Every structure is written in structure tokens, then in C-alpha cells.
């Protein structure tokens, strides 16, 4: 026999549904989710890391001028300076005093710590999500992991579960994210090869091995001092290690629905929005036919205590005449109060717990195939802050017959009444004035 239902996506919450086949005793299932991942798809676009310069050992030859040659490496700049007269440690270096010339070169490369430390960019797309559900009934506790796009079945002892696709598939990401060591950000990074100096994305590369760079930090070469040997050097300072101290607040603090992150693969867990549908193919060796089905009649329910509040703070007893021992099943057929236990015991009186966030509930309950009702009046608790949430639907609406709005029909009927003598005493002379 096959069935369909919907369950709310919120961790640690009971929900329950039926089958009522024909002939046989009823059967009540409960469904409860324990985990909910989420996963987008990525494709890399570039990386960045810190860099380092090199100034390899400038060249002097005296009374003979120069010429330097070009060569392939990113951001190579050579220069040529006339009229230099150094003065090294031992004495004066060489004496062809007027006509001396000197060259200089330097370049930029990646540092030695890039293969442990980098900050990469990415791009997002449509995403899929998977859940873990604990389902119990009959004589069996089981749990099951499942994809949520509507194609993946799974086998319990004879039964098939396939899940509805989604309510809606929005995500707490937009199209461009950037990931650096255990938290994800939300930037808008420059495209490629257009990083102006100083800010983020100053050194690019695709997949992190080698051979290709991009570097525009504005190298210029300056004139050396009067009577020394060094190489001067001028540069706007680096762009990576000026980002990781004056940064932002991360995305682990402005996530919308409690949606927590941890990422060697990027995820978003326990994210609590919406409904997930479920459908059911149920086997046949998990019912009871009629032989051990007890017959129960003249059911009468009362109440003794209630609060609102946030847990199982409503108690009720039951009265019934038995004929045979066994085990029946219980349910309340309305959305205003959910019960606690999944199977009452046999002969005598027995109690049931329930919770309801309303002033005056009324519903109909049925331990086995006979039905009954019982209603109550309620009062608020004296507290303000709890540590554990939400064990009711959250519907606080008035009933059709309460102390509160039994006042309502008297006033509306009362105001409905006094026009009624007014309407006809108009008319009773309205005929006679056509004499």
C-alpha cells in the first residue's frame, strides 16, 4: 500500500502520519530528521598568494660602458646609469673616473610559503541537499540517509521511500565567493589581469603549480648614492598581507537561518527552512489483521492540567471497557495539539501527554477505530527564557466555543437583535400610509 506526506525541515521535532487500510488495524508512523547538509558546485578561476623580490648582484665594469639584454620573466626591468664612482671596502675600486657606467635589474616571484598558504576564488551554481531521517513504527527503530532530488530510493525491511524534490532551492550564497582557511567570504573580485596595485588580487595564477604569472606593482629603478655600492628600490607595498588585518566581518556571523559552515568541502548545515515531501511504499508483514486486535468501545476523555508552554505540559486520562489485552495505537486528528507516545497499553485507564499553544483547545482523539473528543481551558506559565525550543506547530487561534467568544455571540446577536424590532416597525405603518 502506498502513501504520501510532508514533513517539516527542523532538527529534533516529532511528526507522525497514518495509514488506514481497510479491515486491518490502523498503523501510525513517525518521521524525524537529525541532520541536513547542503552542497553547491564549484569551478576554480584563480588564486593569489604573497610574493618576494630578487635583486641579483649588480654589475660594474669600468672605462667601458654597458649594454644589458632582455629576457623572459614577469616584470623584468633593467637600467643604465652613467658617471658612477664607487668606493668599496679596501680602497677605491677602479680609476677610469669620468667614464664609468653601471646597470641594475630585479624581478618578482612567488614566495616559499604559497603551497601551505593561499586564498583562492571560485564561482557557485545550483545546489543539491541531502538529509538523514530516523523513521520508526511497528517493532523497529531505523535511520536512513537520503538524497532529496526525487530519484533516490532506499530499502528498509521490504519498503521503499522516495522523497519529494524541494520546496525551493535558494541558497545563502551568491555567484562569487572566496575561500581562505575555514571560513568563506562574499566579495566581488577583479576579472583577470586588471588588478590595480595595492588591493586584493594583485598577483594571479591559475592551478597552483607554475610557469604563468601576472604582476603589476610599479617597479622603478632609482639612482644609487654618492660613493656606495648598493641597489636602490621602490615599490608600493604588498597587497595580500594588507588585506588579512583590515578585513571585514566573516560569513560565519551574518548567516541567515543559523546555517553553520565548515569547509574542506564547502557545506551549510542544519539550515532550517521549509517543508520536504515524502512518499511511501509499505510492505505487508508489518500490520496486524484482526486476531490480536482488541475491541474497545464507549470511550470518554477528560482533562486535568494544562500550560502552554514549550514542552509536554498537558495531561489527560482515558476510560474504556475492554474485552481482550494487547496494544492499540493513538492519534489526535487536528493540527492544534500533538501527542507524545506512539502506542498506548491495554486494559484499564491510561494517560496521554500533549502540548498546545492556545487558550482553549478542542480536538478529537482515537485510540483504536472508535473516536472521541475532550476539551479544556488553559493558563500561561511564569517564565520568560527557555533553553530548548518549539514542541508545537505554533498556531494560537481561538476556538468555536470558548469562554472568550461566548461573549462574542451575545454582543453580536444583541446588536443583531435591536435592529430587528426597528426594521419591521418601519414597515407596519409603511403599508397603512397608502390608504
Amino acid at each position: 500500500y502506498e502513501h504520501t506526506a510532508v514533513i517539516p525541515n527542523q532538527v529534533g521535532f516529532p511528526y507522525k502520519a497514518h495509514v488506514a487500510r481497510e479491515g486491518y488495524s490502523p498503523l501510525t508512523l513517525q518521521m524525524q530528521v537529525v541532520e541536513t547538509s547542503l552542497e553547491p558546485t564549484l569551478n576554480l578561476e584563480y588564486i593569489t598568494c604573497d610574493y618576494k623580490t630578487k635583486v641579483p648582484s649588480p654589475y660594474v665594469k669600468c672605462c667601458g660602458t654597458a649594454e644589458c639584454r632582455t629576457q623572459d620573466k614577469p616584470e623584468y626591468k633593467c637600467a643604465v646609469f652613467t658617471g658612477v664612482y664607487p668606493f668599496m671596502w679596501g680602497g677605491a675600486y677602479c680609476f677610469c673616473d669620468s667614464e664609468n657606467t653601471q646597470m641594475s635589474e630585479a624581478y618578482v616571484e612567488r614566495a616559499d610559503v604559497c603551497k601551505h598558504d593561499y586564498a583562492a576564488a571560485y564561482r557557485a551554481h545550483t545546489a543539491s541537499l541531502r538529509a538523514k531521517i530516523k523513521v520508526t513504527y511497528g517493532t523497529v527503530n531505523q535511520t536512513v540517509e537520503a538524497y532529496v532530488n526525487g530519484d533516490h530510493a532506499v530499502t528498509l525491511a521490504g519498503t521503499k521511500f522516495i522523497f519529494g524534490p524541494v520546496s525551493t532551492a535558494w541558497t545563502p550564497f551568491d555567484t562569487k565567493i572566496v575561500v581562505y582557511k575555514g571560513e568563506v567570504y562574499n566579495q566581488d573580485f577583479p576579472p583577470y589581469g586588471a588588478g590595480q596595485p595595492g588591493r586584493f588580487g594583485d598577483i594571479q595564477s591559475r592551478t597552483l603549480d607554475s610557469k604563468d604569472l601576472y604582476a603589476n606593482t610599479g617597479l622603478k629603478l632609482a639612482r644609487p648614492a654618492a660613493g656606495n655600492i648598493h641597489v636602490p628600490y621602490t615599490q608600493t607595498p604588498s597587497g595580500f598581507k594588507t588585506w588579512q588585518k583590515d578585513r571585514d566581518s566573516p560569513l560565519n556571523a551574518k548567516a541567515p537561518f543559523g546555517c553553520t559552515i565548515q569547509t574542506n568541502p564547502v557545506r551549510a548545515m542544519n539550515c532550517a527552512v521549509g517543508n520536504i515531501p515524502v512518499s511511501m511504499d509499505i510492505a505487508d508483514s508489518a500490520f496486524t489483521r484482526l486476531t490480536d486486535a482488541p475491541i474497545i468501545s464507549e470511550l470518554l476523555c477528560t482533562v486535568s492540567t494544562c500550560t502552554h508552554s514549550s514542552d509536554f505540559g498537558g495531561v489527560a486520562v482515558l476510560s474504556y471497557k475492554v474485552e481482550k489485552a494487547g496494544r492499540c495505537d493513538v492519534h489526535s486528528h487536528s493540527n492544534v495539539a500533538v501527542l507524545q507516545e506512539v502506542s498506548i497499553e491495554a486494559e484499564g485507564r491510561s494517560v496521554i501527554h500533549f502540548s498546545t499553544a492556545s487558550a482553549a483547545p478542542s480536538f478529537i482523539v482515537s485510540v483504536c477505530s472508535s473516536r472521541a473528543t475532550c476539551t479544556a481551558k488553559c493558563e500561561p506559565p511564569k517564565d520568560h527564557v527557555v533553553t530548548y525550543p518549539a514542541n508545537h506547530n505554533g498556531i494560537t487561534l481561538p476556538d468555536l466555543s470558548s469562554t472568550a467568544m461566548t461573549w462574542a455571540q451575545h454582543l453580536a446577536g444583541g446588536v443583531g437583535l435591536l435592529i430587528a424590532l426597528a426594521v419591521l416597525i418601519l414597515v407596519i405603518v409603511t403599508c397603512i400610509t397608502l390608504r
Binding site: 454582543l411 446588536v415 435591536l418 435592529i419 426597528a422 416597525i425 418601519l426 405603518v429 400610509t433
Partner: protein
Amino acid sequence: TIVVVIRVSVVVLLSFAASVYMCVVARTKCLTPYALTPGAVVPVTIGVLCC
């Protein structure tokens, strides 16, 4: 809470205002030809606040 309480206040009072509005014009028409004659023989129909 406001959105209920103001609408119930206004549906009640105009019907109060309605009820008085048509009862008088009946008292008008039930009275008025008696006002017109040269003769003040109003019968004993005092339940209608006779002059």
C-alpha cells in the same frame, strides 16, 4: 489587536446610528398629518411622544 478593536467599534455604532435614524421618520409620518388640520384632536395614541 488594534485592527480588530477599531472595526468592531465602528460596526456597532452606525447600527446604533441606523436604528435611531429610521425610527424617528416613522414617528414623523405617523404624526405629521395630525399637525396639519385646523383642529388639535390628537387621539390617545401616546406611546409616540405626542405634543
